[PDB]
Structures are given as C-alpha cells and as structure tokens.
Design an enzyme around this catalytic site. Sequence first.
Site, mmCIF file in Angstrom:
data_model
loop_
_atom_site.group_PDB
_atom_site.id
_atom_site.type_symbol
_atom_site.label_atom_id
_atom_site.label_comp_id
_atom_site.label_asym_id
_atom_site.label_seq_id
_atom_site.Cartn_x
_atom_site.Cartn_y
_atom_site.Cartn_z
ATOM 1 N N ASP A 1 -124.074 37.279 -55.074
ATOM 2 C CA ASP A 1 -124.105 36.858 -56.470
ATOM 3 C C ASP A 1 -125.563 36.846 -56.905
ATOM 4 O O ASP A 1 -126.284 35.874 -56.674
ATOM 5 C CB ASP A 1 -123.454 35.493 -56.643
ATOM 6 C CG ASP A 1 -122.050 35.441 -56.088
ATOM 7 O OD1 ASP A 1 -121.426 36.512 -55.957
ATOM 8 O OD2 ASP A 1 -121.570 34.329 -55.782
ATOM 9 N N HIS B 1 -124.608 33.723 -49.259
ATOM 10 C CA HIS B 1 -125.037 32.405 -49.714
ATOM 11 C C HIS B 1 -123.991 31.389 -49.275
ATOM 12 O O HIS B 1 -123.137 31.669 -48.429
ATOM 13 C CB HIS B 1 -125.304 32.397 -51.226
ATOM 14 C CG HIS B 1 -124.125 32.772 -52.061
ATOM 15 N ND1 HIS B 1 -123.472 33.976 -51.927
ATOM 16 C CD2 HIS B 1 -123.496 32.110 -53.059
ATOM 17 C CE1 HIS B 1 -122.482 34.035 -52.798
ATOM 18 N NE2 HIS B 1 -122.475 32.915 -53.497
ATOM 19 N N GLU C 1 -121.175 43.613 -57.024
ATOM 20 C CA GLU C 1 -120.004 42.905 -57.505
ATOM 21 C C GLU C 1 -119.754 43.269 -58.960
ATOM 22 O O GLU C 1 -120.651 43.727 -59.669
ATOM 23 C CB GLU C 1 -120.178 41.391 -57.358
ATOM 24 C CG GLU C 1 -120.327 40.946 -55.918
ATOM 25 C CD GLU C 1 -121.203 39.724 -55.770
ATOM 26 O OE1 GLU C 1 -121.699 39.221 -56.799
ATOM 27 O OE2 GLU C 1 -121.392 39.269 -54.623
ATOM 28 N N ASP D 1 -116.640 30.350 -51.142
ATOM 29 C CA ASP D 1 -115.902 31.598 -51.242
ATOM 30 C C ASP D 1 -116.657 32.752 -50.605
ATOM 31 O O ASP D 1 -116.238 33.905 -50.740
ATOM 32 C CB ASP D 1 -115.579 31.903 -52.703
ATOM 33 C CG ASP D 1 -114.625 30.883 -53.312
ATOM 34 O OD1 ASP D 1 -113.466 31.243 -53.608
ATOM 35 O OD2 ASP D 1 -115.030 29.714 -53.491
ATOM 36 N N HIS D 2 -117.767 32.469 -49.924
ATOM 37 C CA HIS D 2 -118.467 33.455 -49.118
ATOM 38 C C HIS D 2 -118.781 32.976 -47.711
ATOM 39 O O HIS D 2 -119.252 33.781 -46.903
ATOM 40 C CB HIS D 2 -119.785 33.876 -49.782
ATOM 41 C CG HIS D 2 -119.611 34.615 -51.069
ATOM 42 N ND1 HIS D 2 -120.296 35.775 -51.351
ATOM 43 C CD2 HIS D 2 -118.849 34.352 -52.156
ATOM 44 C CE1 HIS D 2 -119.954 36.202 -52.553
ATOM 45 N NE2 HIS D 2 -119.077 35.358 -53.062
HETATM 46 ZN ZN LIG Z 1 -122.229 32.358 -55.489
#
Ligand SMILES: [Zn+2]
Lengths: 451, 353, 710, 436
Positions: free
Chosen positions: D178, D68, D203, D72-73
């Site tokens: 996520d 996504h 996760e 942070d990805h």
């Molecule tokens: Zn996320």
Amino acid sequence: MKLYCLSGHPTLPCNVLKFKSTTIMLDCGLDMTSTLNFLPLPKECSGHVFVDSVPEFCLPETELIDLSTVDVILISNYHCMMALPYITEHTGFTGTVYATEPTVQIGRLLMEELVNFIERVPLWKNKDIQRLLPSPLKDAVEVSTWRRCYTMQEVNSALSKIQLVGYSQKIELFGAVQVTPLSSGYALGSSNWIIQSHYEKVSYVSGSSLLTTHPQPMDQASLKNSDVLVLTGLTQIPTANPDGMVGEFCSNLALTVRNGGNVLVPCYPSGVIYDLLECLYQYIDSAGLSSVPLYFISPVANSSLEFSQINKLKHYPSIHGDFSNDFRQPCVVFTGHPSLRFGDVVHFMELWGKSSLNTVIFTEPDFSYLEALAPYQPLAMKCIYCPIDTRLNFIQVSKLLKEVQPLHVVCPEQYTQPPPAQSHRMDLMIDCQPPAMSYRRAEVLALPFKR
Amino acid sequence: DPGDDWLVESLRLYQDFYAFDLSGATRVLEWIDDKGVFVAGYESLKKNEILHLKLPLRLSVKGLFPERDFKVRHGGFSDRSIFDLKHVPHTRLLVTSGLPGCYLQVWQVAEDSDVIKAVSTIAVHEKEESLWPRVAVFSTLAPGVLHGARLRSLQVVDLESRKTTYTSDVSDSEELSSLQVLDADTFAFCCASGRLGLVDTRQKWAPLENRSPGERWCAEVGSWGQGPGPSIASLGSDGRLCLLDPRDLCHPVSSVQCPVSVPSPDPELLRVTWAPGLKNCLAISGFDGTVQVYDATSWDQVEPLFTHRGHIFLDMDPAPLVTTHTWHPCRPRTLLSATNDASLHVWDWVDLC
Amino acid sequence: MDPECAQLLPALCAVLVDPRQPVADDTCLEKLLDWFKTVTEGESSVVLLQEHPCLVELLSHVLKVQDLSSGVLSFSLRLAGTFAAQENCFQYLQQGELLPGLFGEPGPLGRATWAVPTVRSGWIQGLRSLAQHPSALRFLADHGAVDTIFSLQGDSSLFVASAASQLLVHVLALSMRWPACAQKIMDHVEESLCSAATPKVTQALNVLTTTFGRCQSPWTEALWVRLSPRVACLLERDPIPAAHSFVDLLLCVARSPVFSSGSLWETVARALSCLGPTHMGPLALGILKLEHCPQALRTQAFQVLLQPLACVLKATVQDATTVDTLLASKSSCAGLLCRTLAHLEELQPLPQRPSPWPQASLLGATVTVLRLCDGSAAPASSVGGHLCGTLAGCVRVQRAALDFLGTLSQGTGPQELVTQALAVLLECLESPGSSPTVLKKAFQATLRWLLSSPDLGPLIPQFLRELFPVLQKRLCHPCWEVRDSALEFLTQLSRHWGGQADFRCALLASEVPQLALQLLQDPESYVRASAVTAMGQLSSQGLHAARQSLFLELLHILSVDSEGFPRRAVMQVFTEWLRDGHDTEQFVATVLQAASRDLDWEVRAQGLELALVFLGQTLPLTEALRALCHVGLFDFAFCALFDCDRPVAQKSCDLLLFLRDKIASYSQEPEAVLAMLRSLDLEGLRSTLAESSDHVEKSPQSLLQDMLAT
Amino acid sequence: MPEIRVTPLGAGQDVGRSCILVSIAGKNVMLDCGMHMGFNDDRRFPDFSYITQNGRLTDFLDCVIISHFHLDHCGALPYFSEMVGYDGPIYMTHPTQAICPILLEDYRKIAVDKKGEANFFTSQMIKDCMKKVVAVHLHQTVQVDDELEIKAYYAGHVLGAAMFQIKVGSESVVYTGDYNMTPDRHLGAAWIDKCRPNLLITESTYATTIRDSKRCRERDFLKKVHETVERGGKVLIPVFALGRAQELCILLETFWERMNLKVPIYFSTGLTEKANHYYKLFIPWNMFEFKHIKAFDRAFADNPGPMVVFATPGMLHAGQSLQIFRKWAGNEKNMVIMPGYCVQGTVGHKILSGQRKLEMEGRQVLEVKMQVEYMSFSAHADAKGIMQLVGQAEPESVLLVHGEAKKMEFLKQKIEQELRVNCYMPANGETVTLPT
Ligand SMILES: [Zn+2]
C-alpha cells in the site's frame, strides 16, 4: 607491459607497471609486521629473540628499478601510503602523485599519529648472527633494506606533492595514456584505477567491498572490456562474516563490562573505528547497555571526529590531563597503536594486564595477535580475537571475474593456492577462466599481449 | 505555514469543502446529470483524456456514505485539445470541439465498459481555425446542434442526417466571445466587443441586440420564465460588469465595477454565471486565484458577498487563475472551480445573510 | 425455518434481483448460503417452496433478466444446487424447464460470464451439490454436461480445475454403485493417460489418486487390474510425466491390502530404480512407512534413502546419480541433504521402521555433516573437499542436521554417542558465525541430549562448567531472539535439574544468575518476560545471587510497565509461588491490589486464578472469611463480574460458583453474604457468559435484516 | 530458459485476503501472507493446499516477505509459520516487526471472545513466529540463498511499509504494498530508481477514484469534533491498538494547541511513549509528548461535560467501546466516528448502513440517537499515483492484484495506450506466466 613487484605482502602491495615509455607505480605500502619483532616503548620474550632497539619499518624493494625514473604514483587508500615519505624523499623522485581528498586527509591523520608516537617517546640484523639467532628472529626476510622512522618535515613535504582527484575524473600524460580512478566502497574514498591507452586497456582493483552502502559503492560495471586485470587485497582471514564478528565484538564487550571490569580496544585512530563505533552505538541502543563511558584516546582524535561529521564518545588528546578526572570504572578505551609496540596502550596494558576481570579485544586483521601479544605474558587479562575484514572474499571474486572476464588476470602468489593452514578448503583460490598468472617479490613479470 | 491558519478560517467560512487534484489541467465542465461531471485536459503536445467522474456520494444526500471522492465513470482519449463540450438530453452523445480540428467530434458513451468511443464527426466550412467556434445542443424533440465561430457560421443542423436546417447567412466577419442556448425557440450570444444579441429561429435571423458604444465582454442570460428582473450579465477585462434587462435591452440597468485586484491578464479566462437555485445571485471569476459571488437587487463598486481563495494556499508560484467555474443546479450555494495547476475544488459557503 | 425470516424472504428476493441496487456483498451471500444449507438439510425442500413460493421467482429471474452480476449468479446456482438434492424437490424444481435451463445453455453457460472464475466455481459446486440420487445421474448423462467438465478440467484457475476433478470423482463414485456415465469417464481417463503433455496426464493421475484410496469396493480392484499397464508404461518417457502425481498415485494405491491380490510391487521397484533424485525420496519414505511389503523392497527403499548420508560419510576422514547431484551445485546438494535428513527424521519415531536401525552410523553421519557445515571437517578425497566447499556456511543443512541430531535422543545406547553429540553441539554453540535460528535449534537439541542419559554422573559436571561460559556469552547477543532462547533454555534446565548438587554448584559458581537478574530491564518486551520467568524459576529453588528484594523488583514490573507480556509473566510467577506453598495475607492483598487496575484481559484472569488458589488454601470458617475479606477479594470479584470482556466475567462466575458451593456446604455472618451470592442468578449468568460473542450478530435473522437494510 | 510466474492466492477482487506466490527461475517466494476478518472458520486464512502439494514448505519456498503490518497483509503469519509448518526467514522491516505482535494479540482477544479458535494460534505461536523474523533496513540489500538478493525501499501509508525488490540476476520483481505519492503531513512519499524490472506487482484498489487531498479530510474531522465539543456532548472514536489512534491523537493535539482548548482527550493504553523508539525510526523513515492526552478508566467515562474518548476493542467489536457506546446511546448530543472499514458481523456494520435499533444480550433492545460518522483516513495511491509510479520505475510489464476486476477494463487500456507496455490482470488463482 613489463611488471615489477616491489613488495609481497597481500594487503600492502607495491606494483611497478612499465609501459613503452610511461612507468606507473601503484600503492606505495609499508609492512609494519616487521615492527612486531622489537620491544615496546615504555631479549628472550617468552623464549623468542627480540631486537630491543628503535622500532623499524620494512621499506619495499627499491634496488630492482631506479626509483627516480618512475613516473607517477597512484594511491588506493590510506592504508597504502604510510611509506610515502621514504619513496618521495630518500631517492630523488621527481614526478607527481595523484590521490583523492579523504584519502590524503586520513593519511595525514595516521602519519601524524605515527610520528607523534615515535617522537613523543624519546645488533641482530647480521646474516649469520640471524641465521643462528633463535626463532622467529631468523624467520624475518630481507633485513638489509630496512629504514628508521621518518620525520614530520618529510610528512609535510610529501603531502605537498599529492594532487587531489575527484571521483571518476580523467587525467592524461605525455603519451596518450589516460588514467582514471573509480570508487570501490572500501573506505571513505577508496579508488580502484584504470590505465587505458590506444589498444592496451588495463584495470587495477585494490581492496574493494560490497557491504554497507554508506560510502560510494563499488562500480563493478565500469570495469568491463579490460584486458589485463591486476588484482590485490582480498580478505585477510579465510572464513568469517563481518556481521558475525561484530556480534562477537559486542557480545564480549557487554559480557566484560556487565561483570565489573574494563575493556581495552587497540585500533587505528581512523578506519575500522567508524564501523566499530556505529555498530556499537546500534548495540547500546539495542541491548539496553548504557551508563558506561566510551573514552577514545588518540592525539589526532579531534580532526578525526570532525571529519567523520563532514555525547557518549569522549575524545582526548592523551591520558595525562582531563582523563584522571573523568576516568570512571568500567570503561571502554579505544586507544593505542594496534601492533602494541608503542603508545599509551602499553601503559594501559601494564596497568590492567594483571587482573582477570578486564579484557583486551583485537580487531585488526593485519597484525597477528599471538606474536603481537607475546612480549607481555604472563597475562591474566582474557585476550580475544575478532577480525573485522570487509574486503572481497573469494566467492565475490569469482562472481566479479565472471561479470567482467578480461583476457588475463595477474595476482600475488597466495591467491592461486589455498591458505597455508587450510589446504583442504580448495575453494579459496582464484578459480578464473582462463587460469591467472602470479608473481612475488622482485619477480620481473611480462605478459607480452602485443597485438 | 499559512495552511493551518487558512484552514481554521475555513472552519468558520465554508460548510463543505473537497479539494481534488486532477491528472491534467481542465478548462471545460458540464454535467451529464446530477450524478457525475465531465472533464477533459487541454494540453497541446500530449493526448487528452476526456473523463466522466461520479460525484461524491455525500453531496447528493437527501445517508452517511463511506466515500467522499470522485470515481472515474468513463474514459476516452483524443489528440486535439478540447475547448468545449455539451450533453444531449436523454442521450449518451457528446458533441465536442477543440484546437485543432475543423470538425466537431461526437462521442458515444459506452454501456458495459468504462471507455468512450468517438462515433461521428460534424464537418464545417471553417477556414480560419485559429479561432475556435462555439458549440451547443438543443433540448428539442429532434437534437439540434447550434454552433459556429462567426455570425455567418452560427447554424442549426440536426444530429443524424447532416441536414443543415438553418443559418444566419449574415455578412459580418466577427468572432463572437459567448453563445448560449436559451430555449427551443430562441437563443442569445455576445460578441468579442460587447455586442450582445438575442436571436430567433422560427423567423429569419432577427437580431435584437444592444449595441456596445478591445477588452472582451463575456455574457450570460439569467433565469428564463420568471417574469421581471434584469437577467443579462456581461463582464469585461477591466472589472467592468454590466447587467441589462431582457424586455428592454437598449437601456442599461446596473453597470458597475467589481473591485477586482487586477484587470485580468487574458480575457479568454473570464466567466460569469447566475445562481440557478436562488434569485438575482450572480458569480464572477477569472482574474486571480479567487472567485467572487454577489447579489444584484441590493445595488439599486460594491462589496463581494463571498470570496473564495483556496487555490493560493494549499498548492506563490506564477498566478494560478480559475480557468473555469460552475454552479450546481440543486444545492443552493456550492461551486466547482478548476485551476490551471491540475486542481479542482468543490465548496459550499455559509448562509451568512 | 423460523417465524421471523418469513417476513423478510420476499423483500430479499426483490432486492437481490434488482439491477440498480449496489452490488451485493460476498461475506453476506456465503453466510446466507450456509444458513440455507442449515435450513434445507434437516427437513424436506418442497414444503419450503409451497410455504414461501418466492425463491422460485429468483431462480426464474436467473435466466430472464439477462443482466445480472457475476457473483450473484454463483449464489443462485449454488442455492439451486443445495435445494435440488431431494427427489420430490429435484422434480418440483423442474416443472417449468428450470434445472435443465439453469445449468444448460439457457443458463450462465451461454452468456458472457464464462470468463470470470466465480461463475465456473459456482456452477461446478452446484452440480456437485445436487448429484446424489439417480435422477441426477440421468440428467448428467442425457442432456450432456460431462463434456463440459472435460473442457473445464484444463482451465487456468486451480480452484476450478480441482473442483472439476473432484466432481468427476463424485459422479463416478455415484454412478458405479459398466453404465454409460462411468464408462465415458473411465474411457476419457484412460485416453488422457496416453497423451504426451503434462496437464492431461497430471489431471488423469489426480482423478485416479482421488478415486483409489477413497472408496474400497471390489470394482476398484478390477479397475486397477485394467489400468496398471498404462501407469506401468508411463515410466519410459525421458521427461517422466510430472513425476509427482505418479508417486502420489503409487503411494496411495499401495496402502490397501485389497490390491495385494502382485503386479504393483514390480512397478514400485522399477520406480525406485528410475525416478529422479527428487521424487525417489518421498516414494522411499512412503514405502518404508507401510506395514506390509516384500522385505527385498523395503531393503532397497532404506538403501536409496540412506544413499546420500553414506556418500557423505564416505569421503570425509572418519553411487552415481547421488554423487553427481551432490557435486552439481550448492542448491542441489543443499536440497538433497535437507530432504534426506527430514525424511530420516520422520521415519524414526514409528515402530515399523527397519530392525535393526543403525544408531552409530547415523549419528556419525549427522555429526560429520554438521562439522562440514561448520568448517572443521577433514576431507579425504576431491569430492570430500568440494563438498566441504559447497557446504561451508550453509544454513538449511545446519537447521536440518540440528533437528535430526535432536531427534536421535530417545535411542538409548553407549556413553560414547552422548559424548560425541554434546561435543559437537557445544562446538556449534560457541561459534562466531551462527545465525540466531541455528542457535535456537542447537539449544533445543542440547537440552534434549542432556536430559536423555543413563547424582549427575562422571562426565556431566565438566560439561556444565564448559557450557556456562557459552550460555553467558549468549545472554548478551545483539539479537533478542538469542537472549530469549538462552533464557528459556536456562529455565528448562533449572526446572529439570533443580535439586541436584553438581548442577547447583556449577551454576552458583559461574556468573549466570546476576546476568539473568540484570536482564529484567532489557528494552524488548519478550526478553523481559522470559527473564522474569527464568528468575521466578531460579528463585523458587533457592539460587539467588533473602528473595524479598527480588519480589519488589518483579512487583515493580507489575505496577508500572509499558507492555503487557511482563505483566502476565509476573502474574504467572506469583500464582506459581503461591501454589508452591512458598506474610501470605499481605502478599495476596498487594497482588490483587496491583491486578485490580490492569488494562489487559489476561492479567485479570491470572489474578482470578491466584484468588482461586488462595481460596483453596483457606478452606473455623470465620477467620478464613476474615482473611479472605481483608485481602479484598469481594471488590475484585464483584467488579470483574459485570465486565466488558467475556473470559474475565466467565472466570469470575466460575469463582463465585466455587465459593457459593463451599460456603453453602459449610452453612460479618456468612449467611448474609451467602444470600448475596445467591441474589444474582449465577446459573443464568454462566449460561449467558458461556455463549459465543456473536449469539446476537451471527443469527441469520440479523443477517437478513442487514442484507435488506442496504 | 526461465519464466517468471505469478500466482495470486485468495486475492483478486477479494481485497480482504492477500497472498502472491512469485516463481522466478528456480526460486519460489511468497509476498504478503494475509488474513480475512468476518468469517469464523478456516475459510479466513488462504488456501495453502496449492503450495503443500509437494515436499513441506520449508523446502519449497525461499523467503516470505511481509510488506507492512495491517491485519490483511500479515494476519495469517502465525498460522502459516507454526501450524502448516515453515521454518525459514520472514523478511520484515523494523517497525513492522515491533508492531505485529500487538495487532496479532488484539485479534487473538477478539477471536477468543467469539469462540473462533478451531485452527487458531496462541501467544506462544506468535512468539515462535516472531523469532524467525529477520528485519531489514531501508535501502539495505540482503543476500538470501546466495542467489536471491532482496532490497527494500520506502513507500509510506503506514509507519513501516515498504516496496521490496527481488533480484535473481537476469530477472527481478518489484512488489509494491500500500504505497503513497502525495507527500501528506504524516509520513512522506515513495521512491525508486529506474531498475526497469521484469514486473511490477502493484495494487488496484483505488485505480478509478480521484481522491481528495488529506487537507479537506482533516478539516472535516476537526470541524465535526469541534462542533460536537463546543455544543456539549461527547465524541467516541473506536480504534484498534495501533494504526489510526496515534495519528488522530497527533492531529487533535496540534489543533487544540493552535486554538487553545481544554477538554480532555483520552487514550486507554498509553504505550505511545514507547513509540519514541520507532518514532525515532522516522528519522530513518521529548520530541512530542502530550499535554492533554491523559489515560483512561471506567470511572469517569460517565460524568457529564464535553469529552473525547479513544477506546480499543476494534470496529465496535465486543469489549470497551461496545459498553461505552451502550451507555452513551440515548443522547442526541454525543456522536461516534469510525476511522475504518467495519466488516460484516459487528455492531459497526449494523449501524454504518441503516439500522438504528440494536439488540443487546438476550431479548434486549438498544436505541440509537447519537450521530454516526464515517471518516476514511486511509492513504492509498490512486490513478494519478499508479501512473506516476509506473512512469517513475520504467517497468517492462505491470500486474494488478489486490484490486477488483472491472476497473481494469479502463486502467489496463490506459496503461497500454500510454506506455505501449503490456499489462495483465489475473483472477484469484490464474497463473500469469511470462518469458524473460
Ligand atoms: Zn496497508
């Protein structure tokens, strides 16, 4: 056990399997390519000998095996049923014919469109007279067993006898010879078949696909354990990737429209047109091109779109009427019979075929656009070729042959050798282990796997 | 959708509101302290995961904390459906009980991991296992388990040396419906017929009981060490609640009918509690998807000072009843209610009066 | 340190070791250690423990509390490391049995923390941080740690293993400047080089790789003389020992004339002969990139480099392991050809490449592989046909070949080569079945090939009239990647060949301008931006399809547009037009009026740049300032000055400085506005604004205040 | 013959970063190339030195896969595609591809303010990194490298997340970003048929937390906002360009319609109408255009009267919200609400824990009296969600990255004792190998 092959065209087969007692037929197909030899329905066409008469359709072989004693006639998809009237009427056939629901609905649509295009519109077939006639009139084959166009009564009488079969159902016969259809993702309701028995299970693939998943995808699993796998209908073009050709279609369309001309698209009323229109809507929303009217003109449009369900595209029954009111310019007119032998597309061509801002765009992988267009030259309209064939290529054929791996495989002649044009690309052939067997028109084949 | 409407009502009604969705339906609550709570599923065909869960950082403020949700402190598995649980003061030892099992399990809380070990069993002469016994710990110098299913089974035994120290040894075959540790010198109970009783330990079994002249009466004693003030509540399956006094227990004090929407279907899911932070405020629950709270001294069928109905809107289907409720010992007006449909709510209410 | 953190250090020493506090952060600890290094790298270290004798209490707690957290042990360990790096301090930290304890069994080595990688990493980093002076060597030798490092140099945490190997190398390079420490290290290394596993020999070769090439003392020469037998005998196992650190070791030894004093080149030849067709390439290229080498060796190197392209050009109408690999599968052939073309691409722009350097054969091989990938080849044997098969419709081979054939463009030669290259590139531009990345690469290659020929010649205008239909079909592809690629290609072309008769004729003849002009309303913002730049460029030359009604269009895109890319592209176009000298007063007025209310930080900057260009064009100063005030630069300047972003205020300060310089050099009346521009301290202003935006938040004082607040 | 290997880089109790290098029989794949704010040098981006110890990455890898659009990805994508060098496909989804440039441009602004561009990309590199992206459609199954076939799914938690499946025939991995299981009133919930993959790289950020349903969250948000509005005194919500701002806008609109308020709600950069397109995509994943949500300007952000304000420099980084909150500071009526996790090194992380006496430019000093509030609207799955998903997939193993290392001491034991299937827990670099 025995096998007769009553037609040779790759996409439009006719395969008569003969068991001990039962005699099953597969995919009664019509070869409209012969129709490419005649004149339109408004001589030396650019130097080719054309038999100006009523359009004609090559019936498959019949003399090889008595067509009354055949038992059952399956059907894979709508493209392989336009020759049903002749086979179910002109000989006295008595058995039943199984199919699926959308198959028979779309076959109804196409049959009605064809009979409309032949009815609304109101000498060289000799042996030596052809063998001396100019080419490619002499290039034809089997000019004896041809037939004229059927009539609506035959259409309805044939639709009378077709029995609907749901997905993956099962059917029995006199002997313990079960048959069963499995979807194959080609069209809205394609069906490969299985003919199982006590000890001689057989599969039969016909024109499947592995692309977009909105139909019921191919059931490559349920085909294992097979013993003799008849195979038909691979891709008609050797090398292309449908996404590339859709990109080409949309690019040429937008190049012509943005210039100030009109775009003509010959196509069947139902079939490829769903894919074409979905991708063209995606484009219109992607490249911002809008404010162009998409007129669709086919006398069977209403039921076609209503079934596509179960405001840009404006569907009409014909041109004479509401068209000369909404007909803007530019436009994108999907119309005509794709063979350009009969229909309103003749009017549209003769109207537009003189300027150089307009453009025709072929999309049918069956009808070769060169000879299909030749009777119109000189032509100042920029012609284009853009086949869209979502069938099985040869890589996927080898992969599925691995994933199933039956004892033998039987195929047409054109699949154990590269195409006649590209002989250096020696990958385009059925490289299956063990190597497969082949046939051709009127070939009596026999795989005596009696054990 | 009624949800947003009920939410805009809550905007005026409550002060805090957290609506957690547990893994499995719990019917047991007891604080190890004011930093976390214990829960345990009660399903029969599957294992039951006793969980110790950290309270949300927001509730126990005395800053503005990032998180507002339960954190799993300690886990443990079992095969018997737990129906009761406690905590021994100053220790890391939980005495439990449930169906089936003719032995009170005793679990040790781990220290350097998030697991929970079963460390001991307490063996009982329990032949009738279709009635599960009550259990309780003592807040004594020596941790004293006091428990039993029948009056003859009410016994005091210590923790380690299995030395049975005390027992009623009465003849009755009655299966009580409530038990309570009150202090290190006496405790109380209530039968399944309304037969209350305040019993002593330093002497022989000395039943000081009010007699009940089959709807079950669940009971609880109020504040101890306050002086006057009738402090014994007991409610039946008809909506009949009763308050009696400690010092003169024979004469009733305030016997009335709480205007419940329906006589409870199962008197096994009935409960009443007192407000350990306020005075004469008492809560009832167990009849429907609601919970009620009243004040006592203003009665000498009354109106419910507060009614909570959260479990009916957020989650129509077969009646989700509050299988248990619980007060908070520090915040004046917060409750914690657990429902048979795997939900748990913690909510405060506005100081309307 | 500073007179502020003194008031905080004991509070921090108390809150770090506390067990009930929240687990301390990681960013805070790493920045704390960075600050501690900045402190105790410029001065002594014993004074810092005589002035604040509280950190030693923490270092003592490290081996007393027995229940610290895995993630603060690392901090304290690396702190002990960065402190115990000076002699006086290296001993002032031992009075109490602390350092032998901190790293020995009395430390985290003996607890149940030797299972979390952070503690291993902190331990190794601390050890490396202290080991610089000979007392550290005494400690590392006597008490015994090197065996611990030998144990860690097999671990399953690549960070730990690599740090351990670097620590071994640093200990050796410290010691040997044979003493016992370096002796033990080299004995273990040469022992490991004899094992039959991958990890042992891989770690040994990595130690050797980091040892050689990094330090150039004469003892390394004798070391290599001693170690050459084992390396040279490694090339006999059937699964060559990992075959990559080996190549790296050879290639890193070779780049030193010191080791030319003659048994290396024999090993390099044996390697080029035996290594597999996956490492032979890198070794061959690393050898060919070397200044000094026996010419027979470089000959064989270029030969084993060119082998695959020669085999490809052999069996197409126009030697065992290479052809085997090419006919193996599709993955092997694709990888081999991609690697070979990438190598040949890197080898060219160097001047040490072999002389002569085949330009015609290489170009022919590239064109043949590109045609094979397309599908228009002409096989000449069974292997040629099977290769045409296994390369039909590949994409990595096509990307690599396009980039190569784009790199062979500064090699000047006959026109036949340019014609061949442009022919194949145009046949690749017009092909249904060309992914967008292939098309972008092919546009770049075509541009570089057009601009590198010997007023536009006898062969170009035909190619331009052949190209522009294809560039027209590409301006409508259903993928904004290709539309943008074609627009930027048109921009580059029309910027290099703007004033030529034949190009302008062939452009205005076709239908490219009106398509570009219609592309200013494509949905995707990137296509709009690129079309805006292309239209600005095509306009500044005079190639429309007056320019006035173009201006408004662009102006509209500046006024009301959703995205930001078109706005800054339009501002760039306007700055271009104005710098060009290409009615001006109202122009600048409306542009500043449309830029003074934009919510980007780039549009205001470009507007300030435009104001600077106009100012330069202005400076009879009275009429100049009258124009400069009717445009309305005062409002923009004084309102962007006290802004909320750093770059805009910085640029405005630059502009005000420039203006004050000029106006005070020349000196309403300019005197009053000059006094105004003097009123604010533009010097202190630019000093403040030229700072980093964390000159108040990075300050270690704020770091300590933060860490103690929690 | 083959072995599935999984190597975390950066991630593992270091939730900030993210990068997972999968190695199927002969194919390397990288999932979730991530950034890490807070730092100010090359430590932020991952350590790409344990990949480049070979030929260039263009030859090693096969295809990056970005779950996504969170920074942070996908934050270190332009650095991984241009500087380090990687010329290949980067399979995203459509809204991710449409949103990523904006977020990366905002962070470029932030890091150019702080003078942190030693090794840092520029808008041209972001363009050249978006040109390589090859979007996929949900449940559409694409065929990379003729033998590595990948296919997306639907997860939730943001407008554009996914759960990818990577198939090489005999083996397959299922990467879950996520994800979310509670069908909240914004997007939906995940779905997957029982592919029985060889792994499931989930996760474990919230593995040991029982999270409240979003109803109470939205209720408390509305309560605080409404109570601060009716009293007199303005609210300030610092938000990035995309992410929370749109959802808080929709929520405030739907509640102020239900209660018929009039106070103005502002959002500075009004590109939510473009959102139409990808809100169109919500039918794959006019219809609502606002009555109260106006645009912003520095002019009337100071006149009195109740007001809500959405500014966009980030988590009270340099820029707009810093100046606004600077002007609004000395007033007990106003309040600030942080809908995110303020990382170390900003005013937000100085206020959100303790300190209330800031320090402005130079020796200056700022006081704080306004209320401060922290409201997490993030929607990750948790214990119940993790277990329900693992059950819903029937995986032959489970791996736990993007999470801590002590909570596994119960999560792993639960998964094992519940499914009798093994579970793993690598650290920041530990290769986890398993045979087919
Ligand atoms: Zn996320």
